[PDB]
Amino acid sequence: AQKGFQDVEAQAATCNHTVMALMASLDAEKAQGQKKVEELEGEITTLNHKLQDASAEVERLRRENQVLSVRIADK
Amino acid sequence: QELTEAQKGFQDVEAQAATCNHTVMALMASLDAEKAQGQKKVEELEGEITTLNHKLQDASAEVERLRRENQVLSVRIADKGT
Ligand SMILES: *[C@@H]1O[C@H](CO)[C@@H](O)[C@H](O)[C@H]1NC(C)=O
Numbered sequence: 001a002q003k004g005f006q007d008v009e010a011q012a013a014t015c016n017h018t019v020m021a022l023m024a025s026l027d028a029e030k031a032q033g034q035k036k037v038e039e040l041e042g043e044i045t046t047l048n049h050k051l052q053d054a055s056a057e058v059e060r061l062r063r064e065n066q067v068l069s070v071r072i073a074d075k
Numbered sequence: 076q077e078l079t080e081a082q083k084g085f086q087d088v089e090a091q092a093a094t095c096n097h098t099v100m101a102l103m104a105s106l107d108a109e110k111a112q113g114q115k116k117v118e119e120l121e122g123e124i125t126t127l128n129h130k131l132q133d134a135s136a137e138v139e140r141l142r143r144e145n146q147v148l149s150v151r152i153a154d155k156g157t
């Protein structure tokens with residue numbers, strides 16, 4: 001049954017390698033996931049800034065136009 | 076007496092391999108789980124960015140509309156200048 005011990009010990013070595021491999025994997029996947037999410041975050045941010053610029057121009061115009069209308073009124 | 080040493084060493088090495096097998100199993104579980112999560116979060120982000128784009132567009136439209144509305148009003152105010 002000692003031969004059995006040898007075969008099993010070996011089986012355990014193999015398994016350990018596989019586990020290490022998976023681990024490297026998971027860690028890697030987490031890294032990738034993290035960076036993609038980071039890209040999207042940044043695109044959402046700049047996206048936002050451009051939307052602020054937009055709404056600002058808008059409110060500004062609404063104001064300048066309201067004013068014009070009023071000026072026309074008193075005329 | 077080595078025989079006993081090998082019954083033991085064997086027993087713990089057996090148990091050990093079993094532990095690793097469950098271990099790997101759990102690792103795959105966790106890996107696919109992580110993929111899932113990843114794809115999910117990104118879908119969310121995508122939907123978010125799309126929405127950002129439509130709102131931004133609508134904004135730009137609105138701005139132009141108001142510049143025209145403006146050029147009109149301005150011409151009236153110039154008419155009054157007479
Ligand atoms: C499992 O893998 C690690 C990392 O190489 C190794 O150092 C350790 O001895 C292994 N464990 C067993 C019980 O074989």
Ligand SMILES: *[C@@H]1O[C@H](CO)[C@@H](O)[C@H](O)[C@H]1NC(C)=O
Nearest residue numbers: 011015089091092093094096
């Ligand atoms: C461990 O898992 C492998 C692959 O499924 C299997 O072939 C092997 O017999 C298992 N070992 C033990 C100790 O259960």
